[PDB]
Ligand binder design. Structure first.
Ligand code: BCB
Ligand code: BCB
Ligand code: BCB
Ligand code: BCB
Ligand SMILES: C/C=C1/c2cc3[nH]c4c(c3C)C(=O)[C@H](C(=O)OC)c4c3nc(cc4[nH]c(cc(n2)[C@@H]1C)c(C(C)=O)c4C)[C@@H](C)[C@@H]3CCC(=O)OC/C=C(\C)CCC[C@H](C)CCC[C@H](C)CCCC(C)C
Ligand SMILES: C/C=C1/c2cc3[nH]c4c(c3C)C(=O)[C@H](C(=O)OC)c4c3nc(cc4[nH]c(cc(n2)[C@@H]1C)c(C(C)=O)c4C)[C@@H](C)[C@@H]3CCC(=O)OC/C=C(\C)CCC[C@H](C)CCC[C@H](C)CCCC(C)C
Ligand code: HEM
Ligand code: HEM
Ligand code: HEM
Ligand code: HEM
Ligand SMILES: CC(C)=CCC/C(C)=C/C=C/C(C)=C/C=C/C(C)=C/C=C\C=C(C)\C=C\C=C(/C)CC/C=C(\C)CCCC(C)C
Ligand SMILES: CCCCCCCCCCCC[N+](C)(C)[O-]
Ligand SMILES: CCCCCCCCCCCC[N+](C)(C)[O-]
Ligand SMILES: [Fe+2]
Lengths: 332, 323, 258, 273, 52
């Protein structure tokens, strides 16, 4: 039950502090190859003729694209999301403007979401940006999504054992443990932290002595808040395939400045970003999705850190198609 | 080499010995028997064992505690037997997850935890009486009962005195294998890194020191086993070449030395202080210190290091930053 | 305002830091370091022609005496002035105080260096109920050798020099702890037994091997006054004898290993 | 200068190396060849610490830190101020420790007692090497070793643990901790018993070997006995590091994931998954 | 080493509260910091010093 040396190690803090990444080369290579399946940019087309707003019947988001451009976008979208199904996954065969199929209407909102991420959350995604492929990876149902309960396997392309099935109550603690890097922390950091903006992640005081008036009895937050924040961080670590020292000097988890790496501040934005996506794009899609899509409380599948990162500190090792498809943002 | 220090080369069998106590001699239940393999590295007689009221009391409370824990644990895998055996380590009985203050929690949110906590406490009390009594029955001092008291007090400190002191049951220690472990990290995080708590440092000092001292003592006695150094009681009341040689080894090495009695005093004291320092550290935490690292920073003790990767401002404090 | 604050800068935990340190050094210096001095003090030395002094320091470092009331009668009080009255066959190898001494006779017999015993009581150690504690199995008859182990009675003892030195004749058992502590051998070509502590004995199936001393030196193993009893001071003498072999059994043994 | 009983023991002989040359005492200390080298190394190492410390930003005891090289210097020699000092001090510490160990064998030899103590002292020297030498070697860089600072060495322990997410689930650590705790309890028990018997209270008699055994047979149904408790104690203490070393060596060279996840070999036996 | 003996022989400190303000506490570590123009006349510890 062990991993043969050598291990790849990096340094993320001042020398002698034991801060940095510890990687198993075979594992990194295996993710590298999986992420390598990112289709390349379709060849660029010449911008000839009328905005498709004139040309087509029912184009809201991409209306300013010339025809050749727009069709390039549709070809890309098709290879990113529904390559095995082809164009008809979202379209009526005989009427391309028909919103008849729900993938159509979802895909429209997804174009808006995607352009939002690349335009409005550059503080997380920067000039790497995302495309439909980042989450979907060539299937309509993205392989790593979250419901309002822990579910297993994490990759939904895999087939549940009986115990993994969300219905099987005896498999709960295991469902929860595999989401928090195998710990027994009895909390689900997704529904607590990432689905919405209701809870506060910071639990550690910023004064040496207890402030009178928040430090006794019901004035104080329960210690369970600390376990939850630890659970969320186990989960963040496993999601990016990294450890705490990627982001913290464990000397003082709660300090910034020299006690935190740039990747921590970027992770801070990603938390805000993931909450936006969940609250304003993804959770609403339960209105437009089949019942087969929805969880046991009628929730649309939603996003955590893994949905994009899928075990890597940068999704797809930093690969980008932003310049290739500016339709998808940033929108100036 | 002295092979006797490794194992007993020729084992002696003889009729078993009973030292009469002031009471309860009728409660020594059982037949001694003898393990031959155990006899190679220890005394071969296993048993008899004394029962008694406090001991029986202890087993009663203790088992009740265990039933509540295992029953709540069984509830957690929904009384699936195979999942129970598979997930056992991960399973636990938790304190209030919600802030009820010092309010008695509902059964489903820490109520059972408090119950098991109470029975375990009574269990420890009863056992303490047993450990104290037997010494008195046999005409011995009560040094062990006092070293044990410190240990029980520590447990009470992390179990209910600290929770009481800050006014929340939410802070007590879960029952379970991984859960009582996770608590260690939750509690250190909440209180600003226990490495920066002086009494945590004291406690580790004495704990490491017990390792040093029992390694050095155990070794010192095996090294003079040839001179009967193991017979420590009569080496106290009548110093022999064993402990003259033991003392001189240490004097010639480190410059000062103990006696064969005082070294046990050092040992006892180091043992005791692990639990005493630990308790003091817990009584101060939350009560008077909220962030041990910042407390060290306040008093000038903390180390600081250059940036390696660039210093990173709190984004939350940036202007325009969301919440 | 804060829990724990006492001033512009003073908080409870800070004062407990100091108390913790005082409690430790008090117990260590004023208590434990004096318990450490109940044997061997006061330190011995020469003195001058004209010198009047119990030093103050010799008084300060000692604890008050304690007295054990012994289980089979008597008391012992420590610390107490216990001079080594015995004449020692040793010589200053060099001038200075740090210089090691050198035996002037036979160190095994003179009992010096690794061959020294302590001035223990010439009393037979007792079991809790008053019997002699360490006695030969000829005497300890309800005692036996566990089924599985060698019975050395009859086996040859073989000395550091490869030579058979005698024949095991008995084991002496510790009746308080159920534990053999000596073998007794008939010394070859002598009309004597010797005891040898079980720690100097490699117990084989077919011989007992003893490397501390050469076969010639069993002759002078210390002699007990009784045949079936042994005193505390005698045990020290018997044990120390073989221990002395380790340094002194041959001329090589005191010198550098390498 | 001499304990009342000491003089008869102060004989020549027993040295490993050197013979009569340093066979002597300075005060209570035996010197010997290895006392000379111990002192040489202490003085060296401590001088390096003073200089290195003066080159840095503090003379506060708790804040002073002398750290190993950046990872990139690999197993090579680093500039004095960027780890070179640390490399030097590490060599002196090792020389001091091993000298101390060998000096103890010479003392044992002169006294005619067993060598169990220097032997026991090898266990912590070993662990020091696991942390500072072997594990850095397996990972390919001196930069993985711990800094020499009172508090900074705790920051290294901290971060090292959190690199593997929750170090508490490291099975080698679990074993290690367990021996730390048992051994502390046992030292309390052994100390307390020997005192309870020799110091019964009031004016009662000192008790016997038979009592010691009766006490623990009564309390727990077994007593290991007088010699054996010292053998047990040397064992429990020693295994604090001998088992711990495996947990330390495994982290990095043989396991790069969080330690909780290692327990998957159990949890994910497919017959109950 | 602070020798044990150096601890044992001292009394607990006492503090005089001075009449026109202040305290003094004795015993206390009071080194002679001043540079002294004196030389060892001889080798041994008992030897008198000589002004330079
Ligand atoms: C893998 C984990 C490690 C660890 C984890 C650890 C923790 C988590 C804690 C300590 C603590 C302590 N550690 Mg560290 N440690 C120390 C020394 C120390 C002391 C500063 C202090 C008390 C230790 C103690 O009492 O033990 C028992 C020994 C006894 C009673 C005999 C007395 C020893 C004496 C106190 C040692 C003092 C050493 C000097 C300060 C060192 C400088 C020497 C000079 C000559 C240059 C040394 C000398 C070494 C080396 C050489 O290996 C070491 C290695 C390590 N420690 C590992 C890296 N240690 C505690 C502390 O309070 O930190 C500040 C504490 O909280
Ligand atoms: C990330 C989390 C950390 C942490 C958090 C932590 C906490 C939260 C606490 C400690 C504490 C302590 N830690 Mg620290 N720690 C320690 C070592 C120690 C111990 C010296 C001391 C606890 C005392 C103890 O023996 O408990 C083991 C002994 C016990 C529990 C006594 C039990 C006695 C009882 C009578 C037994 C009863 C048995 C019955 C069978 C029960 C039956 C029950 C049935 C009926 C259900 C080391 C050596 C290190 C290193 C090397 O890094 C370290 C790192 C850290 N600790 C991390 C910084 N540690 C304690 C402390 O000292 O704080 C000031 C404390 O509370
Ligand atoms: C503040 C720090 C804490 C801490 C930190 C801690 C850590 C960091 C670790 C553990 C670990 C462990 N802890 Mg936890 N702990 C445990 C129990 C446990 C075990 C599951 C395990 C191993 C412990 C061990 O070996 O002790 C020593 C064992 C003793 C003293 C046994 C006594 C034996 C006895 C003398 C035998 C008597 C003879 C026979 C009865 C004879 C029978 C024959 C007769 C009948 C004829 C209890 C029961 C309690 C309390 C208080 O109830 C407790 C409190 C705490 N632990 C604190 C919260 N614990 C380890 C683990 O594996 O976690 C998963 C681990 O790594
Ligand atoms: C967040 C990080 C954590 C952590 C990380 C950690 C690491 C990274 C390691 C340990 C290790 C260890 N931890 Mg863990 N830990 C421990 C306990 C322990 C120890 C049993 C064990 C060995 C320590 C060691 O290597 O000493 C080393 C001591 C040495 C080398 C002493 C050297 C002495 C030298 C021979 C002589 C020195 C002489 C002085 C310089 C002389 C001074 C002269 C003066 C006195 C005159 C407890 C009981 C707890 C609790 C209660 O929570 C805990 C929590 C945690 N540990 C945290 C979860 N711990 C080690 C281990 O074994 O893990 C498996 C280890 O590598
Ligand atoms: C610094 C010093 C320390 C220190 C000191 C000391 N520690 C002591 C003493 C001293 C001095 C004693 O005198 C006392 C003792 O006596 O020793 C022989 C004792 C002890 N330390 C134990 C465990 C320990 N110490 C730990 C730690 C430290 N210790 C620290 C380090 C740890 C840690 C590390 O976690 C652990 C786990 C126990 C063995 C023992 C208490 C038993 C008890 O309190 O029992 C309470 C009674 C019960 C739990 C009864 C129920 C048990 C049965 C099996 C349940 C059966 C269930 C079933 C359903 C019913 C069937 C019934 C059947 C009969 C038909
Ligand atoms: C499992 C068994 C264990 C065990 C066993 C035994 N332990 C022994 C013996 C046995 C059997 C002895 O025979 C020997 C001894 O004589 O006892 C009196 C000894 C001793 N255990 C000491 C410290 C001790 N034991 C620790 C741990 C265990 N012990 C484990 C638990 C710890 C822990 C845990 O931290 C500490 C700090 C010394 C006091 C003493 C060595 C003196 C020395 O070697 O002098 C020689 C050296 C010096 C006096 C100074 C050297 C200075 C160098 C050059 C410069 C400093 C370098 C350094 C790296 C800076 C780091 C500082 C920073 C991290 C803050
Ligand atoms: C596959 C290569 C493919 C084709 C072909 C295709 C064509 C297409 C056209 C011509 C339009 C405009 C038609 C009109 O007048 O409304 C159009 C518009 C949208 N499409 Fe499409 N499309 C193909 C594939 C896919 C796939 C696989 C999806 C769903 C994931 C999809 C979705 C959409 C959506 C939404 C629009 C509206 C765009 C807007 O700006 O509002 N198409 N498609
Ligand atoms: C990029 C412009 C883009 C498109 C196109 C797209 C389409 C799309 C479809 C067709 C669905 C419905 C699938 C179904 O059959 O139900 C869908 C669903 C989800 N998406 Fe998507 N998607 C695009 C981009 C992105 C991005 C960048 C992310 C991750 C941030 C993402 C995520 C998801 C998730 C989660 C869902 C809901 C679950 C589901 O209905 O399958 N998509 N997307
Ligand atoms: C590794 C398992 C790990 C631990 C442990 C950890 C802890 C932790 C704590 C205690 C906090 C609370 C800080 C406070 O109370 O003020 C905290 C906060 C954040 N973390 Fe973290 N953290 C671990 C791992 C990681 C990793 C790998 C990263 C970076 C990718 C990271 C980032 C952050 C961020 C951001 C926060 C602040 C949350 C917010 O402000 O909303 N952590 N961490
Ligand atoms: C979930 C709350 C989450 C975390 C945490 C997170 C962290 C993170 C880090 C630390 C980086 C920077 C890594 C570095 O080495 O610099 C990073 C970068 C990107 N992320 Fe992320 N991220 C979280 C969530 C999400 C989600 C849901 C997505 C996809 C919509 C996403 C995307 C990205 C992108 C793109 C980058 C790469 C930026 C680059 O410079 O290449 N993240 N994330
Ligand atoms: C009711 C009011 C108002 C106030 C009461 C306050 C009070 C007294 C509360 C006390 C709370 C306490 C003492 C809580 C303490 C919690 C702590 C210290 C728990 C720590 C550890 C728990 C652990 C490891 C549990 C493990 C799991 C088990 C119990 C499962 C069963 C396993 C066994 C018992 C193994 C037996 C092995 C043996 C036969 C060798
Ligand atoms: C951090 C725990 C500190 C424990 C203190 C241990 C004291 C060691 C013994 C010092 C003895 C000194 N002496 C000879 C001057 O008395
Ligand atoms: C070398 C040691 C091998 C392990 C032997 C295990 C013995 C069981 C421990 C019981 C200890 C009992 N006690 C303290 C009463 O003596
Ligand atoms: Fe002992």
């Amino acid at each position: 039950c062990f991993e043969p040396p050598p291990a790849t190690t990096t340094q993320t803090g001042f020398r002698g502090l034991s801060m940095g990444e510890v990687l198993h080369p075979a594992t990194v290579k295996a993710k590298k190859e999986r992420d390598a399946q990112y289709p390349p940019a379709l060849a660029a087309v010449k911008a000839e003729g009328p905005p498709v707003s004139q040309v087509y019947k029912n184009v809201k988001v991409l209306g300013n694209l010339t025809e050749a451009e727009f069709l390039r976008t549709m070809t890309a979208i098709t290879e990113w999301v529904s390559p095995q199904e082809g164009c008809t996954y979202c379209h009526d065969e005989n009427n391309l403007a028909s919103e008849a199929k729900y993938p159509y209407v979802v895909a429209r909102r997804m174009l808006e979401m995607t352009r939002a991420i690349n335009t409005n959350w550059t503080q997380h995604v920067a000039q790497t940006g995302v495309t439909c492929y980042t989450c979907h990876r060539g299937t309509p149902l993205p392989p790593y999504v979250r419901y309002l309960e822990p579910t297993l396997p994490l990759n939904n392309r895999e087939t549940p054992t009986h115990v993994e099935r969300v219905e099987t109550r005896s498999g709960y603690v295991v469902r929860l443990a595999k989401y928090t890097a195998y710990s027994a922390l009895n909390y689900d950091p997704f529904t607590m932290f990432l689905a919405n903006d209701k809870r506060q992640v910071r639990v550690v005081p910023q004064t040496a002595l207890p402030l009178v008036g928040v430090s006794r009895g019901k004035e104080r937050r329960p210690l369970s808040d600390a376990y939850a924040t630890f659970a969320l961080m186990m989960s963040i670590s496993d999601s990016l395939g990294t450890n705490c020292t990627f982001c913290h000097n464990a000397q003082t988890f709660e300090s910034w400045g020299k006690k935190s790496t740039p990747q921590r501040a970027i992770a801070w934005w990603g938390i805000r970003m993931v909450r936006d996506l969940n609250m304003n794009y993804l959770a609403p899609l339960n209105a437009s999705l089949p019942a087969s899509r929805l969880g046991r409380q009628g929730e649309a599948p939603q996003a955590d850190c893994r949905t994009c990162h899928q075990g890597v500190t940068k999704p797809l090792f930093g690969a980008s198609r932003l310049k290739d498809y500016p339709e998808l943002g940033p929108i100036k | 080499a002295d092979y006797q220090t490794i194992y007993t080369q020729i084992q002696a069998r003889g009729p078993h010995i009973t030292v009469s106590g002031e009471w309860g001699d009728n409660d020594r239940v059982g037949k001694p028997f003898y393990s031959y393999w155990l006899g190679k590295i220890g005394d071969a007689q296993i048993g008899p064992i004394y029962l008694g009221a406090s001991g029986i009391a202890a087993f009663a409370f203790g088992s009740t505690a265990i039933l509540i824990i295992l029953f709540n644990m069984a509830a957690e895998v929904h009384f699936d037997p195979l999942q129970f055996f598979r997930q056992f380590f991960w399973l636990g009985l938790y304190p209030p997850k919600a802030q009820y203050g010092m309010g008695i929690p509902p059964l489903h949110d820490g109520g059972w935890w408090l119950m098991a906590g109470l029975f375990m406490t009574l269990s420890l009390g009863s056992w303490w009486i047993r450990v104290y009594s037997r010494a008195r029955a046999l005409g011995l001092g009560t040094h062990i009962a006092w070293n044990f008291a410190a240990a029980i007090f520590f447990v009470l400190c992390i179990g209910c005195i600290h929770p009481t002191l800050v006014g929340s049951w939410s802070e007590g220690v879960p029952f379970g294998i991984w859960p009582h472990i996770d608590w260690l990290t939750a509690f250190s995080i909440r209180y600003g890194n226990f490495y920066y708590c002086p009494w945590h440092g004291f406690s580790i000092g004495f704990a490491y020191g017990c390792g040093l001292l029992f390694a050095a003592h155990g070794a010192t006695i095996l090294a003079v086993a040839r001179f009967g150094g193991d017979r420590e009681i009569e080496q106290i009341t009548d110093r022999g070449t064993a402990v003259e040689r033991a003392a001189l080894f240490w004097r010639w090495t480190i410059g000062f030395n103990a006696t064969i009695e005082s070294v046990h005093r050092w040992g006892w004291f180091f043992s005791l202080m692990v639990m005493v320092s630990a308790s003091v550290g817990i009584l101060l935490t939350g009560t008077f210190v909220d962030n041990w690292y910042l407390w060290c920073v306040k008093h000038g003790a903390a180390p600081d290091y250059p940036a390696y990767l660039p210093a990173t401002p709190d984004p939350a404090s940036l202007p325009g930053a969301p919440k | 305002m804060y829990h724990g604050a006492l001033a512009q800068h003073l908080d409870i935990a800070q004062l407990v830091w100091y108390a913790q340190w005082l409690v430790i050094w008090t117990v260590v210096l004023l208590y434990l370091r004096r318990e450490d001095r109940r044997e061997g003090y006061p330190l011995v030395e020469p003195l001058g022609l004209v010198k009047l002094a119990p030093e103050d320091g010799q008084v300060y470092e000692l604890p008050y005496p304690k007295t054990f009331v012994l289980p089979h009668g008597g008391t012992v009080t420590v610390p107490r002035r216990r001079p080594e009255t015995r004449e020692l066959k040793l010589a200053q190898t060099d001038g200075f105080e740090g210089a090691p001494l050198q035996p002037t006779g036979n160190p095994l017999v003179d009992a010096v260096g690794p061959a020294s015993y302590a001035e223990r009581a010439e009393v037979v150690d007792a079991t809790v109920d008053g019997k002699a504690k360490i006695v030969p199995l000829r005497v300890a008859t309800d005692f036996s050798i566990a089924e599985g182990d060698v019975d050395p009675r009859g086996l040859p003892v073989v000395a550091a020099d490869g030579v058979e030195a005698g024949t095991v004749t008995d084991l002496w058992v510790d009746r308080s702890e159920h534990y053999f502590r000596y073998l007794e051998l008939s010394v070859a070509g002598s009309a004597r037994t010797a005891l040898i502590p079980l720690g100097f004995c490699d117990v084989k199936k077919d011989k007992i091997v003893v490397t501390s001393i050469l076969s010639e030196q069993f002759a002078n193993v210390p002699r007990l006054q009784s045949r079936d009893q042994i005193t505390l001071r005698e045990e020290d003498k018997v044990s120390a004898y073989y221990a002395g072999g380790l340094l002194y059994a041959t001329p090589e043994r005191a010198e550098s290993l390498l | 200068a001499l304990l009342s009983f000491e003089r008869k023991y102060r004989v020549r002989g027993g040295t490993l190396i050197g013979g009569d040359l340093f066979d002597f005492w300075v005060g209570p200390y035996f010197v010997g060849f290895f006392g000379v080298s111990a002192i040489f190394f202490i003085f060296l190492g401590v001088s390096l610490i003073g200089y290195a410390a003066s080159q840095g930003p503090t003379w506060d005891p708790f804040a002073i830190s002398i750290n190993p090289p950046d990872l990139k210097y690999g197993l090579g020699a680093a500039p004095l101020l960027e780890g070179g000092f640390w490399q030097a001090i590490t060599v002196c510490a090792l020389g001091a420790f091993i000298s101390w160990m060998l000096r103890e064998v010479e003392i044992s030899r002169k006294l005619g007692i067993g060598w169990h103590v220097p032997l026991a002292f090898c266990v912590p020297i070993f662990m020091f090497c696991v942390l500072q030498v072997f594990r850095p070697l397996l990972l390919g860089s001196w930069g993985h070793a711990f800094p020499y600072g009172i508090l900074s060495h705790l920051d290294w322990v901290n971060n090292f643990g959190y690199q593997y997410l929750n170090w508490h689930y490291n099975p080698g650590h679990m074993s290690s901790v367990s021996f730390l705790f048992v051994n502390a309890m046992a030292l309390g028990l052994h100390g307390g018993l020997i005192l309870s018997v020799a110091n019964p209270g009031d004016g009662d008699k000192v008790k016997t070997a038979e009592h010691e055994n009766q006490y623990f047979r009564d309390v727990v149904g077994y007593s290991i006995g007088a010699l054996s408790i010292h053998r047990l104690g040397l064992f429990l203490a020693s295994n604090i590091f001998l088992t711990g070393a495996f947990g330390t060596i495994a982290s990095g060279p043989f396991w790069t994931r969080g330690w909780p996840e290692w327990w998957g070999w159990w949890l994910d036996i497919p017959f109950w998954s």
